[PDB]
Ligand SMILES: *C(=N)[C@H](C[C@@H]1CCNC1=O)NC(=O)[C@@H]1[C@@H]2[C@H](CN1C(=O)[C@@H](NS(C)(=O)=O)C(C)(C)C)C2(C)C
Protein backbone atom coordinates (compact mmCIF):
# COMPACT_ATOMS: atom_id res chain seq x y z
CA UNK A 1 0.00 0.00 0.00
CA UNK A 2 2.49 2.59 1.22
CA UNK A 3 6.08 3.75 0.94
CA UNK A 4 7.63 2.55 4.20
CA UNK A 5 10.50 4.35 5.95
CA UNK A 6 12.70 2.89 8.63
CA UNK A 7 12.30 4.50 12.08
CA UNK A 8 14.95 7.19 12.48
CA UNK A 9 15.42 6.73 16.24
CA UNK A 10 18.77 4.96 16.23
CA UNK A 11 20.22 7.38 13.66
CA UNK A 12 19.07 10.51 15.50
CA UNK A 13 20.91 9.40 18.65
CA UNK A 14 24.21 9.09 16.73
CA UNK A 15 24.07 12.24 14.57
CA UNK A 16 26.57 15.00 15.35
CA UNK A 17 27.55 18.35 13.88
CA UNK A 18 31.09 19.03 12.65
CA UNK A 19 32.32 22.59 12.07
CA UNK A 20 35.75 23.45 10.66
CA UNK A 21 36.92 27.03 10.02
CA UNK A 22 33.47 28.18 8.95
CA UNK A 23 32.39 25.10 7.00
CA UNK A 24 29.65 23.16 8.81
CA UNK A 25 28.00 19.83 8.03
CA UNK A 26 26.81 16.68 9.79
CA UNK A 27 28.53 13.52 10.94
CA UNK A 28 27.58 10.14 12.34
CA UNK A 29 29.13 8.91 15.58
CA UNK A 30 29.54 5.14 15.94
CA UNK A 31 31.71 3.73 18.75
CA UNK A 32 34.60 6.24 19.13
CA UNK A 33 34.64 7.41 15.48
CA UNK A 34 32.83 10.25 13.72
CA UNK A 35 32.37 9.86 9.96
CA UNK A 36 31.87 13.06 8.00
CA UNK A 37 32.46 14.29 4.43
CA UNK A 38 36.02 15.40 3.81
CA UNK A 39 35.24 18.72 2.09
CA UNK A 40 34.47 20.29 5.52
CA UNK A 41 38.17 21.24 5.54
CA UNK A 42 38.15 22.91 2.11
CA UNK A 43 37.09 22.68 -1.52
CA UNK A 44 40.10 20.81 -2.87
CA UNK A 45 40.39 18.77 -6.07
CA UNK A 46 42.14 15.64 -7.31
CA UNK A 47 44.95 14.41 -5.05
CA UNK A 48 45.23 17.50 -2.83
CA UNK A 49 43.20 15.79 -0.10
CA UNK A 50 45.93 13.52 1.28
CA UNK A 51 48.21 16.44 2.19
CA UNK A 52 45.53 18.87 3.40
CA UNK A 53 44.05 16.27 5.77
CA UNK A 54 47.53 15.44 7.11
CA UNK A 55 48.11 19.08 8.10
CA UNK A 56 44.56 19.59 9.42
CA UNK A 57 44.49 20.70 13.06
CA UNK A 58 42.56 18.23 15.22
CA UNK A 59 41.65 21.23 17.40
CA UNK A 60 39.90 22.98 14.49
CA UNK A 61 37.23 20.21 14.43
CA UNK A 62 34.38 21.44 16.64
CA UNK A 63 32.11 18.39 16.99
CA UNK A 64 28.96 18.27 19.14
CA UNK A 65 26.24 15.63 19.50
CA UNK A 66 23.19 17.80 20.32
CA UNK A 67 20.57 15.23 21.34
CA UNK A 68 23.13 13.95 23.88
CA UNK A 69 24.16 17.48 24.92
CA UNK A 70 27.86 16.53 24.95
CA UNK A 71 30.61 18.17 22.90
CA UNK A 72 33.24 15.81 21.52
CA UNK A 73 36.98 16.30 20.94
CA UNK A 74 38.93 14.97 17.96
CA UNK A 75 42.06 12.97 18.83
CA UNK A 76 43.19 11.80 15.37
CA UNK A 77 41.99 12.53 11.82
CA UNK A 78 42.16 9.90 9.07
CA UNK A 79 40.85 10.09 5.51
CA UNK A 80 39.11 6.88 4.39
CA UNK A 81 37.94 7.31 0.83
CA UNK A 82 36.15 10.64 0.48
CA UNK A 83 35.24 10.68 4.19
CA UNK A 84 37.09 11.73 7.33
CA UNK A 85 37.30 9.28 10.24
CA UNK A 86 37.65 11.56 13.27
CA UNK A 87 38.57 9.39 16.25
CA UNK A 88 37.15 10.97 19.40
CA UNK A 89 37.82 10.54 23.11
CA UNK A 90 34.38 9.18 24.02
CA UNK A 91 32.65 6.01 22.87
CA UNK A 92 29.05 6.56 21.76
CA UNK A 93 26.89 4.54 24.15
CA UNK A 94 23.96 4.80 21.71
CA UNK A 95 25.90 2.97 18.98
CA UNK A 96 23.79 0.08 17.65
CA UNK A 97 24.96 -3.05 15.95
CA UNK A 98 25.68 -1.56 12.53
CA UNK A 99 26.98 -2.66 9.15
CA UNK A 100 28.38 -0.76 6.17
CA UNK A 101 26.39 -2.16 3.24
CA UNK A 102 26.81 -0.81 -0.27
CA UNK A 103 23.64 -0.35 -2.30
CA UNK A 104 23.09 -1.73 -5.76
CA UNK A 105 20.95 0.45 -8.06
CA UNK A 106 17.21 -0.09 -7.74
CA UNK A 107 17.30 -0.57 -3.95
CA UNK A 108 15.67 1.78 -1.46
CA UNK A 109 16.85 3.50 1.70
CA UNK A 110 15.60 5.99 4.25
CA UNK A 111 17.35 9.37 4.17
CA UNK A 112 17.80 11.06 7.56
CA UNK A 113 18.41 14.60 6.34
CA UNK A 114 20.06 16.55 9.15
CA UNK A 115 21.25 20.08 9.83
CA UNK A 116 23.58 21.20 12.64
CA UNK A 117 23.68 17.59 13.82
CA UNK A 118 19.90 17.17 14.24
CA UNK A 119 17.57 15.25 11.93
CA UNK A 120 14.90 17.56 10.49
CA UNK A 121 13.29 15.41 7.77
CA UNK A 122 13.24 11.76 6.77
CA UNK A 123 12.23 10.60 3.30
CA UNK A 124 12.41 7.65 0.92
CA UNK A 125 14.79 7.31 -2.02
CA UNK A 126 16.03 4.67 -4.45
CA UNK A 127 19.52 4.54 -5.95
CA UNK A 128 19.02 5.11 -9.68
CA UNK A 129 20.97 3.53 -12.53
CA UNK A 130 22.96 6.76 -12.97
CA UNK A 131 24.14 6.23 -9.36
CA UNK A 132 22.26 9.32 -8.20
CA UNK A 133 19.45 9.64 -5.69
CA UNK A 134 16.61 12.11 -6.28
CA UNK A 135 16.52 13.69 -2.83
CA UNK A 136 16.10 17.04 -1.07
CA UNK A 137 19.00 18.84 0.59
CA UNK A 138 20.04 22.40 1.43
CA UNK A 139 23.31 23.92 2.62
CA UNK A 140 24.80 22.14 5.62
CA UNK A 141 22.92 18.91 4.84
CA UNK A 142 26.09 17.01 3.89
CA UNK A 143 26.85 14.15 6.22
CA UNK A 144 23.18 13.12 6.19
CA UNK A 145 23.00 9.34 5.99
CA UNK A 146 20.83 6.89 4.09
CA UNK A 147 20.02 3.72 5.97
CA UNK A 148 17.81 0.65 6.28
CA UNK A 149 16.98 -1.52 9.30
CA UNK A 150 16.77 -5.32 9.51
CA UNK A 151 15.78 -6.48 12.98
CA UNK A 152 18.28 -4.91 15.38
CA UNK A 153 21.04 -3.92 12.95
CA UNK A 154 21.42 -0.45 11.43
CA UNK A 155 22.51 -0.82 7.79
CA UNK A 156 24.21 2.39 6.68
CA UNK A 157 24.35 2.83 2.90
CA UNK A 158 24.95 6.48 2.10
CA UNK A 159 26.41 9.80 3.20
CA UNK A 160 25.54 12.97 1.33
CA UNK A 161 28.09 15.06 -0.56
CA UNK A 162 26.86 16.77 -3.72
CA UNK A 163 23.82 18.35 -5.38
CA UNK A 164 23.79 18.50 -9.17
CA UNK A 165 21.74 21.37 -10.62
CA UNK A 166 19.07 18.95 -11.89
CA UNK A 167 18.05 18.19 -8.26
CA UNK A 168 20.00 14.96 -8.20
CA UNK A 169 22.28 14.15 -5.30
CA UNK A 170 25.49 12.18 -4.91
CA UNK A 171 27.56 10.81 -2.07
CA UNK A 172 29.64 7.93 -0.79
CA UNK A 173 28.89 4.77 1.07
CA UNK A 174 30.26 4.71 4.58
CA UNK A 175 33.49 3.13 3.32
CA UNK A 176 34.14 6.43 1.54
CA UNK A 177 33.60 5.44 -2.11
CA UNK A 178 31.16 7.32 -4.32
CA UNK A 179 28.24 5.85 -6.19
CA UNK A 180 29.07 6.34 -9.85
CA UNK A 181 31.85 8.50 -11.29
CA UNK A 182 30.95 11.68 -9.37
CA UNK A 183 33.46 13.43 -7.10
CA UNK A 184 33.20 16.06 -4.36
CA UNK A 185 34.29 19.03 -6.46
CA UNK A 186 32.33 22.18 -7.32
CA UNK A 187 32.31 21.64 -11.09
CA UNK A 188 29.94 20.38 -13.77
CA UNK A 189 30.30 16.60 -14.10
CA UNK A 190 29.10 14.40 -16.95
CA UNK A 191 26.03 12.34 -16.08
CA UNK A 192 24.91 8.85 -17.04
CA UNK A 193 21.85 8.96 -19.27
CA UNK A 194 18.80 8.19 -17.16
CA UNK A 195 17.42 4.66 -17.42
CA UNK A 196 14.35 3.30 -15.66
CA UNK A 197 14.74 0.46 -13.15
CA UNK A 198 12.12 -1.66 -14.89
CA UNK A 199 11.58 -3.96 -11.89
CA UNK A 200 10.52 -0.97 -9.79
CA UNK A 201 8.31 0.56 -12.50
CA UNK A 202 6.61 -2.83 -12.74
CA UNK A 203 6.12 -2.71 -8.97
CA UNK A 204 4.50 0.72 -9.30
CA UNK A 205 1.81 -0.50 -11.70
CA UNK A 206 1.17 -3.59 -9.56
CA UNK A 207 0.82 -1.46 -6.43
CA UNK A 208 -1.79 0.58 -8.31
CA UNK A 209 -3.71 -2.57 -9.24
CA UNK A 210 -3.63 -3.72 -5.61
CA UNK A 211 -4.81 -0.52 -3.87
CA UNK A 212 -6.21 2.09 -6.31
CA UNK A 213 -7.96 0.25 -9.15
CA UNK A 214 -7.79 -3.41 -10.17
CA UNK A 215 -8.95 -2.66 -13.74
CA UNK A 216 -7.69 0.76 -14.86
CA UNK A 217 -8.61 1.71 -18.41
CA UNK A 218 -4.91 2.20 -19.26
CA UNK A 219 -4.08 -1.42 -18.37
CA UNK A 220 -3.13 -3.10 -21.64
CA UNK A 221 -5.32 -5.83 -23.10
CA UNK A 222 -2.61 -7.74 -24.96
CA UNK A 223 0.59 -9.23 -23.57
CA UNK A 224 4.17 -8.75 -24.68
CA UNK A 225 6.82 -11.36 -23.99
CA UNK A 226 9.72 -10.47 -21.72
CA UNK A 227 11.99 -11.00 -24.73
CA UNK A 228 9.98 -8.69 -26.99
CA UNK A 229 9.88 -6.10 -24.21
CA UNK A 230 13.65 -6.30 -23.71
CA UNK A 231 14.12 -5.54 -27.41
CA UNK A 232 11.95 -2.42 -27.09
CA UNK A 233 13.55 -1.52 -23.75
CA UNK A 234 17.01 -1.18 -25.31
CA UNK A 235 15.75 1.77 -27.40
CA UNK A 236 13.44 3.36 -24.81
CA UNK A 237 15.64 3.91 -21.73
CA UNK A 238 14.29 0.91 -19.79
CA UNK A 239 16.69 -1.56 -18.21
CA UNK A 240 16.66 -5.20 -19.26
CA UNK A 241 13.92 -7.11 -17.51
CA UNK A 242 14.38 -8.40 -14.96
CA UNK A 243 16.95 -6.00 -13.48
CA UNK A 244 17.37 -8.44 -10.58
CA UNK A 245 16.54 -12.14 -10.78
CA UNK A 246 15.52 -12.14 -7.10
CA UNK A 247 12.74 -9.63 -7.84
CA UNK A 248 11.01 -12.33 -9.91
CA UNK A 249 9.76 -14.12 -6.79
CA UNK A 250 8.01 -10.93 -5.65
CA UNK A 251 6.86 -10.01 -9.16
CA UNK A 252 5.37 -13.46 -9.76
CA UNK A 253 3.64 -13.08 -6.40
CA UNK A 254 2.10 -9.71 -7.26
CA UNK A 255 0.88 -11.08 -10.60
CA UNK A 256 -0.96 -13.87 -8.76
CA UNK A 257 -2.66 -11.43 -6.37
CA UNK A 258 -3.55 -8.91 -9.09
CA UNK A 259 -4.51 -11.75 -11.48
CA UNK A 260 -2.55 -9.82 -14.14
CA UNK A 261 0.50 -11.51 -15.73
CA UNK A 262 3.68 -9.44 -15.87
CA UNK A 263 3.43 -9.61 -19.67
CA UNK A 264 0.41 -7.30 -19.49
CA UNK A 265 2.32 -5.02 -17.10
CA UNK A 266 5.31 -4.76 -19.45
CA UNK A 267 3.04 -4.09 -22.42
CA UNK A 268 1.22 -1.44 -20.38
CA UNK A 269 4.61 0.25 -19.86
CA UNK A 270 5.18 0.32 -23.62
CA UNK A 271 1.71 1.71 -24.35
CA UNK A 272 1.97 4.29 -21.55
CA UNK A 273 5.03 5.83 -23.23
CA UNK A 274 2.75 6.86 -26.12
CA UNK A 275 -0.57 7.47 -24.35
CA UNK A 276 -0.42 8.00 -20.58
CA UNK A 277 -1.97 11.45 -21.25
CA UNK A 278 -1.69 12.51 -17.63
CA UNK A 279 -2.72 9.25 -15.98
CA UNK A 280 -2.03 9.27 -12.24
CA UNK A 281 -0.58 5.83 -11.47
CA UNK A 282 -0.05 4.90 -7.81
CA UNK A 283 -0.31 8.59 -7.00
CA UNK A 284 2.28 9.90 -9.46
CA UNK A 285 2.14 11.41 -12.94
CA UNK A 286 5.52 9.77 -13.66
CA UNK A 287 7.21 6.44 -13.99
CA UNK A 288 8.52 6.04 -10.43
CA UNK A 289 11.46 3.90 -9.36
CA UNK A 290 10.58 4.38 -5.67
CA UNK A 291 8.42 1.23 -5.45
CA UNK A 292 10.56 -1.85 -5.12
CA UNK A 293 9.01 -5.28 -5.74
CA UNK A 294 10.00 -6.37 -2.24
CA UNK A 295 8.37 -3.39 -0.54
CA UNK A 296 5.18 -3.76 -2.59
CA UNK A 297 4.94 -7.52 -1.99
CA UNK A 298 5.92 -7.60 1.69
CA UNK A 299 4.79 -4.17 3.01
CA UNK B 300 58.73 -9.36 -6.22
CA UNK B 301 55.23 -8.33 -7.34
CA UNK B 302 53.01 -11.13 -8.64
CA UNK B 303 49.35 -11.73 -9.37
CA UNK B 304 48.19 -13.36 -6.13
CA UNK B 305 45.45 -15.99 -5.93
CA UNK B 306 43.69 -17.54 -3.03
CA UNK B 307 44.21 -21.18 -1.98
CA UNK B 308 41.54 -23.42 -3.49
CA UNK B 309 41.55 -26.06 -0.74
CA UNK B 310 38.56 -24.64 1.11
CA UNK B 311 36.54 -24.53 -2.12
CA UNK B 312 37.72 -27.97 -3.28
CA UNK B 313 36.17 -29.77 -0.29
CA UNK B 314 32.70 -28.27 -0.96
CA UNK B 315 32.50 -28.78 -4.72
CA UNK B 316 29.88 -31.27 -5.90
CA UNK B 317 28.73 -32.57 -9.25
CA UNK B 318 25.08 -32.00 -10.13
CA UNK B 319 23.56 -34.12 -12.90
CA UNK B 320 19.95 -33.78 -14.02
CA UNK B 321 18.44 -35.68 -16.98
CA UNK B 322 21.73 -35.78 -18.86
CA UNK B 323 22.88 -32.24 -18.03
CA UNK B 324 26.07 -32.09 -15.95
CA UNK B 325 27.15 -29.02 -13.94
CA UNK B 326 29.03 -28.19 -10.76
CA UNK B 327 27.65 -26.97 -7.46
CA UNK B 328 28.99 -25.83 -4.11
CA UNK B 329 27.83 -27.54 -0.90
CA UNK B 330 27.45 -25.16 2.06
CA UNK B 331 25.88 -26.51 5.26
CA UNK B 332 22.88 -28.50 3.97
CA UNK B 333 22.38 -26.63 0.67
CA UNK B 334 23.93 -27.17 -2.76
CA UNK B 335 23.95 -24.04 -4.93
CA UNK B 336 24.00 -24.67 -8.68
CA UNK B 337 22.87 -22.86 -11.85
CA UNK B 338 19.20 -23.33 -12.63
CA UNK B 339 19.70 -24.18 -16.32
CA UNK B 340 20.71 -27.73 -15.34
CA UNK B 341 16.98 -28.51 -15.53
CA UNK B 342 16.70 -27.20 -19.10
CA UNK B 343 17.01 -24.22 -21.41
CA UNK B 344 14.21 -21.80 -20.53
CA UNK B 345 13.65 -18.05 -20.87
CA UNK B 346 12.03 -15.22 -18.94
CA UNK B 347 9.45 -16.36 -16.37
CA UNK B 348 9.33 -20.01 -17.46
CA UNK B 349 11.78 -20.84 -14.67
CA UNK B 350 9.46 -20.71 -11.65
CA UNK B 351 6.93 -23.25 -12.94
CA UNK B 352 9.53 -25.55 -14.53
CA UNK B 353 11.51 -25.69 -11.28
CA UNK B 354 8.40 -26.61 -9.27
CA UNK B 355 7.84 -29.72 -11.41
CA UNK B 356 11.44 -30.97 -11.22
CA UNK B 357 11.54 -34.13 -9.11
CA UNK B 358 14.48 -34.04 -6.69
CA UNK B 359 15.12 -37.74 -7.33
CA UNK B 360 16.51 -36.62 -10.71
CA UNK B 361 19.10 -34.33 -9.06
CA UNK B 362 22.05 -36.74 -8.85
CA UNK B 363 24.48 -34.88 -6.57
CA UNK B 364 27.86 -36.30 -5.55
CA UNK B 365 30.79 -34.95 -3.54
CA UNK B 366 33.83 -36.51 -5.26
CA UNK B 367 36.42 -35.49 -2.65
CA UNK B 368 34.34 -36.65 0.34
CA UNK B 369 33.20 -39.85 -1.41
CA UNK B 370 29.59 -38.89 -0.62
CA UNK B 371 26.45 -39.12 -2.71
CA UNK B 372 23.81 -36.62 -1.60
CA UNK B 373 20.02 -36.97 -1.73
CA UNK B 374 18.19 -33.76 -2.58
CA UNK B 375 15.07 -33.31 -0.43
CA UNK B 376 13.65 -29.97 -1.61
CA UNK B 377 14.39 -27.57 -4.47
CA UNK B 378 14.20 -23.78 -4.29
CA UNK B 379 15.13 -21.32 -7.03
CA UNK B 380 16.74 -18.14 -5.66
CA UNK B 381 17.42 -15.68 -8.45
CA UNK B 382 19.03 -17.72 -11.24
CA UNK B 383 20.38 -20.39 -8.86
CA UNK B 384 18.93 -23.61 -7.51
CA UNK B 385 19.09 -24.19 -3.76
CA UNK B 386 19.05 -27.97 -3.32
CA UNK B 387 18.49 -28.90 0.32
CA UNK B 388 20.06 -32.30 1.04
CA UNK B 389 19.87 -34.48 4.13
CA UNK B 390 23.57 -34.30 5.01
CA UNK B 391 25.30 -31.26 6.45
CA UNK B 392 28.72 -30.58 4.92
CA UNK B 393 31.32 -31.07 7.67
CA UNK B 394 33.75 -29.02 5.54
CA UNK B 395 31.56 -25.90 5.43
CA UNK B 396 33.77 -22.93 6.39
CA UNK B 397 32.77 -19.61 7.78
CA UNK B 398 31.51 -18.08 4.53
CA UNK B 399 29.87 -14.90 3.29
CA UNK B 400 28.05 -14.04 0.05
CA UNK B 401 29.62 -10.71 -0.93
CA UNK B 402 28.73 -8.89 -4.14
CA UNK B 403 31.71 -7.73 -6.21
CA UNK B 404 32.09 -4.21 -7.52
CA UNK B 405 33.72 -3.85 -10.96
CA UNK B 406 37.48 -3.42 -10.83
CA UNK B 407 37.92 -5.96 -8.03
CA UNK B 408 39.81 -9.23 -8.33
CA UNK B 409 38.81 -12.79 -7.49
CA UNK B 410 40.09 -16.34 -7.86
CA UNK B 411 38.15 -18.74 -10.09
CA UNK B 412 38.16 -22.41 -9.08
CA UNK B 413 37.42 -23.88 -12.50
CA UNK B 414 35.70 -27.22 -11.87
CA UNK B 415 34.46 -30.19 -13.89
CA UNK B 416 32.41 -33.12 -12.57
CA UNK B 417 32.56 -31.58 -9.10
CA UNK B 418 36.38 -31.56 -9.10
CA UNK B 419 38.44 -28.37 -9.24
CA UNK B 420 40.71 -28.77 -12.28
CA UNK B 421 42.23 -25.29 -12.69
CA UNK B 422 42.65 -22.11 -10.67
CA UNK B 423 43.12 -18.69 -12.24
CA UNK B 424 42.65 -14.97 -11.65
CA UNK B 425 40.08 -12.55 -13.09
CA UNK B 426 38.96 -8.97 -12.54
CA UNK B 427 35.33 -7.99 -13.04
CA UNK B 428 35.33 -5.49 -15.88
CA UNK B 429 33.17 -2.38 -16.12
CA UNK B 430 31.01 -4.21 -18.68
CA UNK B 431 30.20 -6.67 -15.84
CA UNK B 432 31.95 -9.59 -17.54
CA UNK B 433 35.03 -11.56 -16.58
CA UNK B 434 37.44 -12.76 -19.27
CA UNK B 435 37.87 -16.30 -18.01
CA UNK B 436 38.34 -19.80 -19.45
CA UNK B 437 35.53 -22.38 -19.36
CA UNK B 438 34.45 -25.43 -21.34
CA UNK B 439 31.25 -27.46 -21.33
CA UNK B 440 30.30 -28.56 -17.83
CA UNK B 441 32.12 -25.77 -15.97
CA UNK B 442 28.95 -23.96 -14.86
CA UNK B 443 28.80 -23.95 -11.08
CA UNK B 444 32.44 -22.92 -10.76
CA UNK B 445 32.90 -20.24 -8.12
CA UNK B 446 35.01 -17.11 -7.93
CA UNK B 447 36.06 -16.30 -4.39
CA UNK B 448 38.40 -14.43 -2.09
CA UNK B 449 39.61 -15.21 1.43
CA UNK B 450 40.23 -13.03 4.49
CA UNK B 451 41.58 -15.21 7.27
CA UNK B 452 39.29 -18.16 8.03
CA UNK B 453 36.36 -16.82 5.97
CA UNK B 454 35.48 -17.78 2.39
CA UNK B 455 34.00 -14.85 0.44
CA UNK B 456 31.99 -16.23 -2.47
CA UNK B 457 31.49 -13.68 -5.26
CA UNK B 458 30.65 -15.51 -8.47
CA UNK B 459 29.06 -18.63 -9.92
CA UNK B 460 29.55 -19.28 -13.62
CA UNK B 461 26.67 -19.52 -16.12
CA UNK B 462 27.40 -18.19 -19.61
CA UNK B 463 30.10 -17.80 -22.27
CA UNK B 464 29.60 -15.16 -24.97
CA UNK B 465 30.99 -15.24 -28.49
CA UNK B 466 33.90 -12.87 -27.82
CA UNK B 467 35.22 -15.02 -24.94
CA UNK B 468 33.53 -13.07 -22.19
CA UNK B 469 31.94 -14.93 -19.31
CA UNK B 470 29.05 -13.88 -17.09
CA UNK B 471 27.32 -15.35 -14.09
CA UNK B 472 25.54 -14.52 -10.87
CA UNK B 473 26.63 -13.78 -7.34
CA UNK B 474 25.84 -16.41 -4.73
CA UNK B 475 22.49 -14.69 -4.05
CA UNK B 476 21.30 -15.52 -7.58
CA UNK B 477 21.54 -12.14 -9.32
CA UNK B 478 23.58 -11.73 -12.50
CA UNK B 479 26.39 -9.25 -12.93
CA UNK B 480 25.16 -6.89 -15.64
CA UNK B 481 22.15 -7.15 -17.93
CA UNK B 482 23.07 -10.66 -19.07
CA UNK B 483 20.85 -13.69 -18.46
CA UNK B 484 21.19 -17.47 -18.72
CA UNK B 485 19.55 -17.76 -22.13
CA UNK B 486 21.11 -19.12 -25.33
CA UNK B 487 20.78 -15.99 -27.46
CA UNK B 488 23.11 -13.16 -28.45
CA UNK B 489 22.86 -10.41 -25.83
CA UNK B 490 24.01 -6.80 -26.04
CA UNK B 491 27.12 -6.02 -24.00
CA UNK B 492 27.96 -2.84 -22.12
CA UNK B 493 30.62 -0.97 -24.07
CA UNK B 494 34.07 -1.67 -22.70
CA UNK B 495 35.67 0.86 -20.38
CA UNK B 496 39.11 0.75 -18.80
CA UNK B 497 39.12 0.58 -15.01
CA UNK B 498 41.69 3.37 -14.74
CA UNK B 499 42.74 2.57 -11.16
CA UNK B 500 43.97 -0.85 -12.29
CA UNK B 501 45.79 0.47 -15.37
CA UNK B 502 47.62 2.84 -13.01
CA UNK B 503 48.45 -0.06 -10.68
CA UNK B 504 49.94 -2.21 -13.46
CA UNK B 505 52.12 0.61 -14.80
CA UNK B 506 53.48 1.24 -11.30
CA UNK B 507 54.06 -2.49 -10.87
CA UNK B 508 56.13 -2.34 -14.06
CA UNK B 509 58.25 0.55 -12.76
CA UNK B 510 58.81 -1.32 -9.49
CA UNK B 511 60.02 -4.70 -10.80
CA UNK B 512 60.99 -4.51 -14.49
CA UNK B 513 62.26 -1.17 -15.84
CA UNK B 514 62.26 1.81 -13.50
CA UNK B 515 61.90 4.79 -15.86
CA UNK B 516 61.37 3.22 -19.30
CA UNK B 517 61.60 5.45 -22.34
CA UNK B 518 57.88 5.39 -23.18
CA UNK B 519 57.07 7.03 -19.84
CA UNK B 520 55.56 10.44 -20.49
CA UNK B 521 58.05 13.22 -19.79
CA UNK B 522 55.33 15.71 -18.80
CA UNK B 523 52.56 15.54 -16.23
CA UNK B 524 48.87 15.87 -16.96
CA UNK B 525 46.26 17.08 -14.49
CA UNK B 526 43.96 14.53 -12.90
CA UNK B 527 41.17 16.90 -13.96
CA UNK B 528 42.62 17.23 -17.46
CA UNK B 529 42.93 13.44 -17.69
CA UNK B 530 39.30 12.96 -16.67
CA UNK B 531 38.15 15.22 -19.50
CA UNK B 532 40.21 13.11 -21.88
CA UNK B 533 38.98 9.91 -20.19
CA UNK B 534 35.31 10.68 -20.90
CA UNK B 535 36.01 10.65 -24.65
CA UNK B 536 38.50 7.76 -24.67
CA UNK B 537 36.84 4.81 -22.91
CA UNK B 538 38.60 5.30 -19.55
CA UNK B 539 36.66 5.54 -16.30
CA UNK B 540 36.93 8.72 -14.26
CA UNK B 541 39.89 8.84 -11.91
CA UNK B 542 39.88 7.78 -9.20
CA UNK B 543 37.51 4.86 -9.81
CA UNK B 544 37.60 4.02 -6.09
CA UNK B 545 38.46 6.78 -3.62
CA UNK B 546 39.99 4.27 -1.19
CA UNK B 547 42.48 3.27 -3.91
CA UNK B 548 44.20 6.68 -3.63
CA UNK B 549 45.91 5.53 -0.43
CA UNK B 550 47.53 2.63 -2.29
CA UNK B 551 48.26 4.66 -5.42
CA UNK B 552 49.86 7.60 -3.60
CA UNK B 553 52.03 5.08 -1.76
CA UNK B 554 53.06 3.51 -5.06
CA UNK B 555 53.85 6.98 -6.44
CA UNK B 556 56.39 7.65 -3.65
CA UNK B 557 58.51 4.48 -3.79
CA UNK B 558 58.36 4.57 -7.59
CA UNK B 559 59.27 8.29 -7.33
CA UNK B 560 56.92 8.92 -10.28
CA UNK B 561 53.82 11.08 -9.64
CA UNK B 562 50.43 9.70 -10.65
CA UNK B 563 50.07 12.67 -13.01
CA UNK B 564 52.87 11.20 -15.14
CA UNK B 565 51.27 7.74 -15.13
CA UNK B 566 48.00 9.25 -16.35
CA UNK B 567 49.71 11.20 -19.12
CA UNK B 568 51.55 8.00 -20.04
CA UNK B 569 48.18 6.21 -20.30
CA UNK B 570 47.00 8.89 -22.73
CA UNK B 571 50.08 8.69 -24.96
CA UNK B 572 50.06 4.86 -24.90
CA UNK B 573 46.67 4.64 -26.68
CA UNK B 574 48.08 3.91 -30.14
CA UNK B 575 42.14 -6.59 -23.08
CA UNK B 576 45.03 -4.37 -24.14
CA UNK B 577 46.48 -2.27 -21.31
CA UNK B 578 44.83 -4.72 -18.95
CA UNK B 579 42.94 -4.11 -15.70
CA UNK B 580 44.14 -7.26 -13.91
CA UNK B 581 46.35 -5.54 -11.29
CA UNK B 582 44.53 -3.88 -8.45
CA UNK B 583 46.29 -1.09 -6.53
CA UNK B 584 45.74 -3.05 -3.32
CA UNK B 585 47.54 -6.07 -4.79
CA UNK B 586 50.53 -4.16 -6.16
CA UNK B 587 50.96 -2.05 -3.02
CA UNK B 588 50.81 -4.86 -0.45
C1 LIG C 1 26.83 19.86 1.66
N1 LIG C 1 26.29 20.20 2.78
C2 LIG C 1 26.34 20.45 0.35
C3 LIG C 1 24.93 19.94 0.02
C4 LIG C 1 24.27 20.73 -1.11
C5 LIG C 1 24.00 22.20 -0.84
C6 LIG C 1 22.83 22.52 -1.77
N2 LIG C 1 22.12 21.25 -1.81
C7 LIG C 1 22.89 20.21 -1.48
O1 LIG C 1 22.55 19.02 -1.50
N3 LIG C 1 27.26 20.16 -0.73
C8 LIG C 1 27.99 21.12 -1.31
O2 LIG C 1 27.88 22.31 -1.02
C9 LIG C 1 28.99 20.65 -2.36
C10 LIG C 1 30.40 20.93 -1.89
C11 LIG C 1 30.99 22.01 -2.79
C12 LIG C 1 29.94 22.38 -3.83
N4 LIG C 1 28.85 21.43 -3.59
C13 LIG C 1 27.76 21.23 -4.36
O3 LIG C 1 27.03 20.27 -4.17
C14 LIG C 1 27.48 22.23 -5.48
N5 LIG C 1 27.04 21.56 -6.71
S1 LIG C 1 28.05 21.36 -7.95
C15 LIG C 1 29.07 19.98 -7.60
O4 LIG C 1 27.24 21.04 -9.09
O5 LIG C 1 28.88 22.52 -8.01
C16 LIG C 1 26.43 23.28 -5.09
C17 LIG C 1 26.28 24.31 -6.21
C18 LIG C 1 26.83 24.01 -3.80
C19 LIG C 1 25.06 22.62 -4.86
C20 LIG C 1 31.59 20.62 -2.78
C21 LIG C 1 31.42 19.72 -3.99
C22 LIG C 1 32.93 20.46 -2.10
Ligand SMILES: *C(=N)[C@H](C[C@@H]1CCNC1=O)NC(=O)[C@@H]1[C@@H]2[C@H](CN1C(=O)[C@@H](NS(C)(=O)=O)C(C)(C)C)C2(C)C
Pocket residue numbers: 325339342343344436437438439440441442443461462463464465469483484485486487488
Ligand atom coordinates in the same frame (compact mmCIF):
# COMPACT_ATOMS: atom_id res chain seq x y z
C1 LIG D 1 27.79 -24.27 -18.41
N1 LIG D 1 28.37 -25.35 -18.00
C2 LIG D 1 28.11 -23.62 -19.74
C3 LIG D 1 29.49 -22.95 -19.72
C4 LIG D 1 29.99 -22.60 -21.12
C5 LIG D 1 30.24 -23.77 -22.05
C6 LIG D 1 31.26 -23.21 -23.04
N2 LIG D 1 31.99 -22.26 -22.22
C7 LIG D 1 31.31 -21.86 -21.15
O1 LIG D 1 31.68 -21.00 -20.34
N3 LIG D 1 27.07 -22.67 -20.11
C8 LIG D 1 26.24 -22.90 -21.13
O2 LIG D 1 26.31 -23.90 -21.84
C9 LIG D 1 25.18 -21.84 -21.37
C10 LIG D 1 23.79 -22.42 -21.15
C11 LIG D 1 23.08 -22.47 -22.49
C12 LIG D 1 23.99 -21.85 -23.53
N4 LIG D 1 25.18 -21.42 -22.78
C13 LIG D 1 26.23 -20.75 -23.26
O3 LIG D 1 27.13 -20.38 -22.51
C14 LIG D 1 26.28 -20.47 -24.76
N5 LIG D 1 26.57 -19.06 -25.06
S1 LIG D 1 25.40 -18.09 -25.61
C15 LIG D 1 24.43 -17.56 -24.25
O4 LIG D 1 26.04 -16.94 -26.17
O5 LIG D 1 24.56 -18.89 -26.46
C16 LIG D 1 27.28 -21.38 -25.50
C17 LIG D 1 27.18 -21.16 -27.01
C18 LIG D 1 26.99 -22.86 -25.20
C19 LIG D 1 28.72 -21.07 -25.06
C20 LIG D 1 22.54 -21.61 -21.38
C21 LIG D 1 22.62 -20.10 -21.50
C22 LIG D 1 21.27 -22.08 -20.71
